[PDB]
Amino acid sequence: SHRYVETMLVADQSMAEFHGSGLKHYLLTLFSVAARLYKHPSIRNSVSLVVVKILVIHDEQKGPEVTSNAALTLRNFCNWQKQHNPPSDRDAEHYDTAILFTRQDLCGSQTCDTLGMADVGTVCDPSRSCSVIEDDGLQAAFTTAHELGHVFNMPHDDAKQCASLNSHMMASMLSNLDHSQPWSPCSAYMITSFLDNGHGECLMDKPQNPIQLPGDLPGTSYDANRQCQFTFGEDSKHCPTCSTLWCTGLVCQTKHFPWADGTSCGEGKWCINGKCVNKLVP
Ligand SMILES: C[C@@H](C[C@@](C)(CS(=O)(=O)N1CCC(OCc2ccc(Cl)cc2Cl)CC1)N(O)C=O)c1ncc(F)cn1
Ligand SMILES: [Mg+2]
Numbered sequence: 001s002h003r004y005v006e007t008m009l010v011a012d013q014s015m016a017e018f019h020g021s022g023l024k025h026y027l028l029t030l031f032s033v034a035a036r037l038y039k040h041p042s043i044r045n046s047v048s049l050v051v052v053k054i055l056v057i058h059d060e061q062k063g064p065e066v067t068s069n070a071a072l073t074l075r076n077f078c079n080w081q082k083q084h085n086p087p088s089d090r091d092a093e094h095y096d097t098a099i100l101f102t103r104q105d106l107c108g109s110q111t112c113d114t115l116g117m118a119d120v121g122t123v124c125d126p127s128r129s130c131s132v133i134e135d136d137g138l139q140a141a142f143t144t145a146h147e148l149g150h151v152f153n154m155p156h157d158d159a160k161q162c163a164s165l166n167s168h169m170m171a172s173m174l175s176n177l178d179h180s181q182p183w184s185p186c187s188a189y190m191i192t193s194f195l196d197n198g199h200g201e202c203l204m205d206k207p208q209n210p211i212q213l214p215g216d217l218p219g220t221s222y223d224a225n226r227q228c229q230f231t232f233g234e235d236s237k238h239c240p241t242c243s244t245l246w247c248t249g250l251v252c253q254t255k256h257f258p259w260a261d262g263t264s265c266g267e268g269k270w271c272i273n274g275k276c277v278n279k280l281v282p
């Protein structure tokens, strides 16, 4: 059976100001990458992330209170998004989940290494189906997949329950993603059970005129200078391939993330899975 995750994307005042007019393309660029990831066969389910609504909070007072407190920010946003969801799924802009994006540096009690936040097993509960994502660059696309995993009842891959079942999207710490198997067996089992138990019944309807997702690779929209800007601010640029984006700040810096797929790395070549390869595949 085919599940469709009708989504409202929301950007706060920090996003509007930082991104200007290009904000909405940026949000859908990030979300198209998430959608691709959920179409990977390793999830062992048929799941279509679709956009039915986008809100930009130009005026802070017209949005939820956003703070460095990542937990309090999720809760603030989860309460706030209820007033903007039409009561019936028959409604066209009715959404099964809501995601907030902020330039704000998210922190837990311990560090500000926090990238994102969601409760576990909330997808068909309109009071609880929410995520907040830190915009630290195109890599936030993967924070978004991760958070939605939690929303789909996925625990981290080092959770005790994942032992006999189990590099993948639901890792508790950042490292090299297996591009041939983005989702672990634990992950597949856990979303599969969640849906089998009946907690994905809201996802069966098809969206009405959903907001169209970019079909091109993200690096086609955004060159390496732009990617450095997204992560390090507008004055940053690409440091004088593909494996690690290094950026100015001659002083250079990196969040140890690859160049986005599609990023030009010479005439006739672009990045694909951290490798500079010919655009005309043999
Ligand atoms: C207690 C929280 C832990 C929390 C907030 C930790 S975290 O913010 O550091 N975090 C873990 C790493 C994860 O990595 C995503 C990712 C994967 C591949 C690439 Cl290529 C890039 C990226 Cl970005 C992002 C979120 N956390 O896990 C939040 O989700 C917590 N919250 C919910 C839980 F279910 C468990 N723990
Ligand atoms: Mg890739």
Ligand code: NA
Pocket (backbone or CB within 6 Å): 105, 106, 107, 112, 113, 114, 115, 134
């Ligand atoms: Na942070």
Ligand code: NI
Pocket (backbone or CB within 6 Å): 016, 017, 020, 021, 023, 056, 058
């Ligand atoms: Ni604007």
Ligand code: NI
Pocket (backbone or CB within 6 Å): 024, 025, 214
């Ligand atoms: Ni666009």
Ligand code: NI
Pocket (backbone or CB within 6 Å): 060, 065, 066
């Ligand atoms: Ni305020």
Ligand code: NI
Pocket (backbone or CB within 6 Å): 166, 167, 184
């Ligand atoms: Ni594995």
Ligand code: NI
Pocket (backbone or CB within 6 Å): 234, 235
């Ligand atoms: Ni400037």
Ligand code: NI
Pocket (backbone or CB within 6 Å): 224, 225, 238
């Ligand atoms: Ni360059």
Ligand code: NI
Pocket (backbone or CB within 6 Å): 254, 255, 256
């Ligand atoms: Ni470092």
Ligand SMILES: [Zn+2]
Pocket (backbone or CB within 6 Å): 146, 150, 156, 172
């Ligand atoms: Zn997590």
